[PDB]
Amino acid sequence: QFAKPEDAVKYRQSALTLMASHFGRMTPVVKGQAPYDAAQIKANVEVLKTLSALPWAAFGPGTEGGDARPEIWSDAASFKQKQQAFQDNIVKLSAAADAGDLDKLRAAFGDVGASCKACHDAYRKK
Amino acid sequence: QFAKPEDAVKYRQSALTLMASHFGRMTPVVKGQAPYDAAQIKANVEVLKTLSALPWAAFGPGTEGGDARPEIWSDAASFKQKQQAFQDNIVKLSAAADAGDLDKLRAAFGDVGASCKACHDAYRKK
Ligand code: HEC
Ligand code: HEC
């Protein structure tokens, strides 16, 4: 859906920006600094779930740019694995949120955060 | 969820960017320049539906910035109506897409596009 590689870069950066917001805005809740409303968190994680599927289709072949490292494309199998795993960690978070289980929420949130960092260490320019 | 008004501006612009992509990428399909796969379009409109609810919460009080006109905040009732209407036009599009009805899809797509322009004429800086 992108006329030029620039448009794919713009898309993925926007998607990752929204993900970051929908993930990070839960940080105070996980830490107990803000109250836990199970229904609020369930709805937010549903949005996160939808958003977390979007960036990967905008790293199509030839869409080098931004702060993407070229290894995303020279090591495609490995990159796919990392996004697939990340999305599996999101499923765990959805399950926690759907169950209304604050302990499972905290644990799953940490695993998601680690998955974010893991990809960035391999595939995002500093 | 925004530490500073700048962060709300960044959020809404990102959300509107993704909306624009998920809406505009259907243009060739509506025109018959690209094939109509009912299931593909149903899934895309589902993403559009989720995205189309997101920008409005990032125009909270005091989040002046970007290309938002100040009338968004001096005329809050009217702005709410325009986003509510826009989202109702999205419901019509979802219904078309869920029914797999290309004629209803074309018509609803045009109405959505008109709703985009209507808000921009009133509330977005040139
Ligand atoms: C690889 C499988 C990734 C996972 C998982 C996550 N991110 Fe990431 N992120 C990745 C890349 C390759 C890039 C660079 C994209 C580019 O073309 O520039 C990014 C970037 C971000 C950004 C910056 C976006 C921008 O405004 O330019 C943010 C805010 C970001 N990523 C956040 C983020 C979070 C919170 C994640 C887990 C919830 C996460 N990303 C996962 C690659 C990958
Ligand atoms: C008011 C109810 C709006 C509706 C409906 C739509 N948009 Fe809009 N849009 C609106 C504002 C006030 C702004 C400026 C936001 C700011 O703070 O800068 C915008 C902006 C856009 C943008 C640019 C985003 C960016 O990268 O800076 C795009 C691409 C955009 N809008 C597209 C768009 C489409 C396709 C719409 C219907 C599907 C649509 N918008 C509706 C206000 C409103």
Side-chain angles (χ1 to χ4, degrees), chain A residues 2-126, chain B residues 2-126:
Chain A
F2 305 120
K4 306 194 183 84
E6 284 88 347
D7 298 310
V9 172
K10 186 173 196 187
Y11 179 98
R12 73 208 186 200
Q13 290 179 345
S14 293
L16 295 159
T17 295
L18 297 172
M19 282 173 63
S21 182
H22 283 275
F23 183 67
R25 73 182 56 197
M26 292 189 291
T27 299
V29 176
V30 152
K31 294 177 170 194
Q33 295 173 334
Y36 177 47
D37 178 288
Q40 184 190 23
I41 293 298
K42 178 175 178 183
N44 183 62
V45 173
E46 184 61 46
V47 174
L48 185 57
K49 181 155 195 178
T50 292
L51 296 171
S52 288
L54 298 183
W56 325 113
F59 292 91
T63 66
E64 279 79 1
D67 282 343
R69 285 184 169 179
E71 290 91 334
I72 287 172
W73 293 277
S74 67
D75 307 339
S78 295
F79 184 76
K80 193 170 185 166
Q81 312 170 3
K82 284 216 206 288
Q83 61 96 337
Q84 284 240 60
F86 164 72
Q87 288 191 79
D88 281 345
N89 278 273
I90 296 290
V91 172
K92 185 159 58 200
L93 183 69
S94 297
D98 291 350
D101 186 328
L102 179 64
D103 291 302
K104 284 168 187 191
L105 202 59
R106 285 171 85 235
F109 187 89
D111 293 338
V112 171
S115 283
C116 306
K117 175 183 199 91
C119 187
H120 293 157
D121 288 340
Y123 295 117
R124 187 173 78 181
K125 292 194 192 187
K126 326 278 152 130
Chain B
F2 305 120
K4 306 194 183 84
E6 284 88 347
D7 298 310
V9 172
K10 186 173 196 187
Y11 179 98
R12 73 208 186 200
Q13 290 179 345
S14 293
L16 295 159
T17 295
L18 297 172
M19 282 173 63
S21 182
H22 283 275
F23 183 67
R25 73 182 56 197
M26 292 189 291
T27 299
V29 176
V30 152
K31 294 177 170 194
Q33 295 173 334
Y36 177 47
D37 178 288
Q40 184 190 23
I41 293 298
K42 178 175 178 183
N44 183 62
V45 173
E46 184 61 46
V47 174
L48 185 57
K49 181 155 195 178
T50 292
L51 296 171
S52 288
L54 298 183
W56 325 113
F59 292 91
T63 66
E64 279 79 1
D67 282 343
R69 285 184 169 179
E71 290 91 334
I72 287 172
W73 293 277
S74 67
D75 307 339
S78 295
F79 184 76
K80 193 170 185 166
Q81 312 170 3
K82 284 216 206 288
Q83 61 96 337
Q84 284 240 60
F86 164 72
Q87 288 191 79
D88 281 345
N89 278 273
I90 296 290
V91 172
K92 185 159 58 200
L93 183 69
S94 297
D98 291 350
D101 186 328
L102 179 64
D103 291 302
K104 284 168 187 191
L105 202 59
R106 285 171 85 235
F109 187 89
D111 293 338
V112 171
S115 283
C116 306
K117 175 183 199 91
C119 187
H120 293 157
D121 288 340
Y123 295 117
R124 187 173 78 181
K125 292 194 192 187
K126 326 278 152 130

